[PDB]
Amino acid sequence: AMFIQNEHVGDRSRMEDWRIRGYDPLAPPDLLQHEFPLSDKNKDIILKGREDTCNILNGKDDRLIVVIGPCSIHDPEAALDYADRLHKLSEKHKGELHIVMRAYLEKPRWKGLINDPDIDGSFQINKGLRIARKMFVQLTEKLPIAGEMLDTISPQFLSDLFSVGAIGARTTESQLHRELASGLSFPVGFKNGTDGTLGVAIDALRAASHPHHFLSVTKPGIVSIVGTEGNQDCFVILRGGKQGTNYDAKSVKETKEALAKAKVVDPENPKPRIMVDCSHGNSNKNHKNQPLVAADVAKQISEGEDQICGLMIESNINEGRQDVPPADKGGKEALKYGCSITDACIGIDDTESVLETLAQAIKARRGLK
Amino acid sequence: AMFIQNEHVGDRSRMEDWRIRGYDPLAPPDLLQHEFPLSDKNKDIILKGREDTCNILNGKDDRLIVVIGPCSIHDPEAALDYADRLHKLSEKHKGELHIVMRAYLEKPRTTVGWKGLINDPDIDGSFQINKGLRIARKMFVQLTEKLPIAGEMLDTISPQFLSDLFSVGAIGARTTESQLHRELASGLSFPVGFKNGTDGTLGVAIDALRAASHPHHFLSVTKPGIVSIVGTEGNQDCFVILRGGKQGTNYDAKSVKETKEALAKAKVVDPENPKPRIMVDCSHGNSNKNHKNQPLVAADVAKQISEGEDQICGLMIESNINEGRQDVPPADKGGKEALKYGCSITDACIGIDDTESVLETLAQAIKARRGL
Amino acid sequence: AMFIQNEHVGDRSRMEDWRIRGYDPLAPPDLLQHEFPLSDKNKDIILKGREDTCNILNGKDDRLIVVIGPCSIHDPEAALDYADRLHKLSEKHKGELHIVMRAYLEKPRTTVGWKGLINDPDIDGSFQINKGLRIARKMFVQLTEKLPIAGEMLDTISPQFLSDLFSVGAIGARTTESQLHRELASGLSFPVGFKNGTDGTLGVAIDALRAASHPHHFLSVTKPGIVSIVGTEGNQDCFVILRGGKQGTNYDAKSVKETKEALAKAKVVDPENPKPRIMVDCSHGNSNKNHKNQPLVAADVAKQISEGEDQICGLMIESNINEGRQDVPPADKGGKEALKYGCSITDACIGIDDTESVLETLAQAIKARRGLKS
Amino acid sequence: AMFIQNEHVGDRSRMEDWRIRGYDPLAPPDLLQHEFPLSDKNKDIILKGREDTCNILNGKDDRLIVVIGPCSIHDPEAALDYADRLHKLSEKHKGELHIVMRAYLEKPRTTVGWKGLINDPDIDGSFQINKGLRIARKMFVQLTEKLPIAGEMLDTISPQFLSDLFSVGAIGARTTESQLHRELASGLSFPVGFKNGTDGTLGVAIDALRAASHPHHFLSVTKPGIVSIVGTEGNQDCFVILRGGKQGTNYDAKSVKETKEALAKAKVVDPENPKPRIMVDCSHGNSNKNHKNQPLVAADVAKQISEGEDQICGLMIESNINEGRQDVPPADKGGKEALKYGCSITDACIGIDDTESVLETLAQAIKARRGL
């Protein structure tokens, strides 16, 4: 099965390896970046994506950050098509919305594109990293992209490509992910806990703003001690949870106050640091509810809310979701094009609509002054 | 300063490194294990510690696992003393208790404070990770010439340096949900415990158990110190740890009953042939952050065991030579050197007197449950 | 440009890097071997090639080892064509000759010129070592589905990428004295030959032979791509290569007699049970760098074999599809695309016609020596 | 028995590893450099050592380079004693001589014997390369707090651990022809010397000089300990070493004249405005392996210098505290502990008395050549 096979797997008399099947070799990040380098067009778009995100997060730009795209990418061809459509929507709304495409590769729980690119229970991580990076180089010739850092190694292969990132709810409390965020070159968002408490996300924001010293993988692929500077461009993501939804004006108000009390936002000159996820907890795992969540946020914006920095929306070419058929009944090749195999997404129609609603809300808020 | 310095730190026009100060070189796990190898005495004790833990967790042995020891070890000499005292108690109660010394190096803190033996072996606020790993591994090799030890996995890299020494382990509460630590547990050589959620719910710990029981493929650091893709087999020797939470303490018979039912519904324990997979943490949330409550919590578990409880596999207790805790003096007033011997600098622990009493209580409970 | 560029190149106030331009990333050997694995056909051919070489080197097989092929391979397509031709000759003469194709990738450049397939696969003065390793390994996996192959170890790292593929190897004359190459030889899985020194001395090759037979401990690159301390077992399957030198040619019966005596005196081959440990290079110094002389050198060795010489284990011959050599045209007037197919761009080789002839001569010499048993 | 042991050693059915016993982990150069860093004192001395060597090799400074010191260092304390004595001599003659201490760790041996400080620091036939590299680097850091040092490059990896410390270097005679060592020299930060061939001819050294002056691209070990492709700039600060050979000794005025002409013909030295690129080794072949001959060779070179010779850039002399040499006693007779202090265990050296005399002669020769 595996390249280097542990001949001693399952021998419990051994001291440390008998639950290791074996190992597969990995291209070092240096190597993968050499094979798939960035052009100047990549650099311009990625750097512009980071600057535009920071300017909103610092209250210098009155647009809204919109992280929007598939729950997870299983089909690079469909993702590039989607990027072409979103790019056009982006040019229409660039006066009001800073659109960043959601380029997530994995759903925590199918392990995702990097872990299992062939979607067949074979694990071809090295190939998956290649497929992932090449697609990201193609995506960022069109528009900036957003990522989820679920692990701490794979950012070494891909982190030059992101203009904004997020820590998964299941790892907001993880010291590993807070240290990771303190050394990334782009703003990072921290989701409230799965039980809906905001504390862990506020804690993560503060931890990530400080320098750290910690063990980590480096670009040649060896483990070293890293020193980070601290990342002050981070924000929280309201994403629902066991206590119910938290996109409403009352939850936003409690969140604004928590940020002030924690001394993260000056209440007299406030920076916007609240992103609302329209999906996941906040939609009750029903994609038809995402436009309703977005509209509620849009209404708060139109009425003068100035600390919501943006929204996250799970969106695809076609709405809904699908399971992967058995290889018996067609396998991966029998999947519908442009349709998520993880969380259900809104289709391209609701997407055009939701984007239009948000842009009007930004226009409405300008009228208020 | 740092060894390799990013001359470009803070230059935002750069694509990926401007929040990296630099790097310090790290001895690979291979190097450290070579300098501090295991003797055959080490291997015998560690393996026996693992075999005994599994036998209890598989319902093949009716003794109780007692993971007991300092909150965090800041003083390797005091820990070796404590280890000798605990070994004697271990010989006395070996008929009823499987004693495993708690060998934790750090108390996770979201706020400031001592980062632990690995990060700051000098207890002076410096970062000397290479030294700390040497100190830690050497101490563990000395400890496991006496008795088995239990470890806490807070990250996924430092286990590569130390995991050959543990007879049982636990994931920190703050990463029970983390896929990384669930993958880690699936490849370890010994049973791993997962703590209940901050809200007192078992779901995240049930999820972790099931995730850990399956094989995984993931990026990982290897003993030569390079990154590879590793494949694990899955770990079916894992268990849950009741440690309280916002709903209060959960060591009581009623909380244990709900926990048994939750495990059965999640199809983790057949309720008709039940394997004991509940470990009760007697400290932290379950003691109201008051060490004098730890013997009471233990007594309550002992009462349940004595009356026939057969799904509690063991207890965790924070125990030291002298009870309580102490702050580290300001270097103004003597620094680390002015510390009292054998007293925690993190969570308050029960002293050796309370420890002997607690162990006798639990042993009597196991004897009591046999008479039924 | 280079991938990681030393921003401080030429800053003589610095302690250690100011003559380093930079670095390019390298696939670790494990990675390259994972992408280009050996089939069972590869293994059977490679292993049989090693078994047959040893059996001749231990005097258990009365055939002749013939290492024959291009001086250096610059064109993988031509090398596969050549290998197909050489395979047929191998079936013809397998009763008498153990034919192993010469799969060398470069001619060491004391001054200037093409650095070889690994160092410069595009033959254009660009350096593309990572690509060169891929091309090299792929070609070897293709070659050894046809016939066993022989290599030259010029450096100590690139064997980590390729050494599972060779059935016999040789150390360059300019490094027979190198402790590095002697330690290297002690850990290889196949017989290794040591060439006599550039000044015509046999001592340095004899010294290397004994050094290579002992276990060693030394710094080395390993398959994951990190440097470790390796311990070897020692290689007792090594031999010397007579290749001419400043003292003139040394393929004649007189030099062969001197070499047998030196080997016996050095306690390298027991004079009472003598094993064949002499390989004659028909090119380089022994042909006066004139490819037309190689068949004459081979015939002279053949005569010695036919008259009963029993310590020559084989011959080395530089052979290509078409004889001679050619320079690389200026990119101005064509570049590599204007090279003659199947013609060396390093040392001049004999063509395919002379090759069939030389092989027939050597095979008859083995037949002749069998008749002396009467 | 080795750290990682090949379970399949000697299985000839395997494709590539059956002549490998196993592996031992190695501290990477980064780690070793972190533990034993250079102070500013080190840097000033090492850099001044390089700048003075270059100035002489470029004919901007009319002193003589004297690389002088033990054949090999087996005892770091005695070497530090020697360096302090030589430092005093260096201050006395700094007007005429640029003194660089010879800091060699091994005597190359095809034959059996002590493998040197790095391979066998304990001088007991064991292999403890990690320990040896630590001892070696720490000593070099101590030596270069006193005076610049000269090294010999026998392999291409261990220079990664030590090359920040040398102010001048040399390729071993057995690898002057080696492409690997020519590439190495093109990337080093200090002048490098190439010895004439065993047969007394200059060809291999001339070729090596020209190859080293050009940029190269090659596989190499890097400071983090991984293998990469390195690109070098070329080293035009290299020179040749006359060291005898089968044609006899080659330190005499006739041999120097032939060497001058060969360098000019090879277009390595401007024949009209000559830069000095000839270093005369007073030991080894040129002394008939008899240390008492070294001062005579030196006096002969001094005679040439005083009479106007301007293309000899320096001398190498094997010098120790006490003259001669000694074998390492067997373990039943005492072992390394029974060694005489300050006495070579490899090549015989001249002692401290001959050393002072030789240096005074050479300085007078430089003074003489100025009076001219």
How does this model look, in words?
- Chain C: It is an enzyme of class 2 (transferase).
- Chain C: It catalyses: D-erythrose 4-phosphate + phosphoenolpyruvate + H2O = 7-phospho-2-dehydro-3-deoxy-D-arabino-heptonate + phosphate.
- 4 copies of one chain form a homotetramer.
- With 369 residues, chain A is α/β, with parallel strands linked by helices.
- Chain A has one domain: TIM Barrel, CATH 3.20.20.
- Helices cover 35% and strands 16% of the residues of chain A.
- The first copy, chain A, has helices at residues 29-35, 40-57, 76-93, 125-139, 155-158, 175-183, 199-208, 249-261, 290-302, 348-368, and strands at 4-5, 20-24, 64-69, 97-102, 145-149, 162-167, 188-191, 213-217, 223-228, 235-238, 274-277, 308-314.
- Chain A has an 8-stranded parallel beta barrel, surrounded by 6 helices.
- In chain A, helix 9 packs parallel to helix 10 (348-368).
- The longest helix of chain A has 21 residues, at 348-368.
- Chains in contact: A-B, A-C, A-D, B-C, B-D, C-D.
- Chains C and D meet through strand 2, helix 2, helix 6, helix 7 and strand 8 of C and strand 2, helix 2, helix 6, helix 7 and strand 8 of D.
- Strand 9 (223-228) of chain A pairs antiparallel with strand 2 (20-24) of chain B.
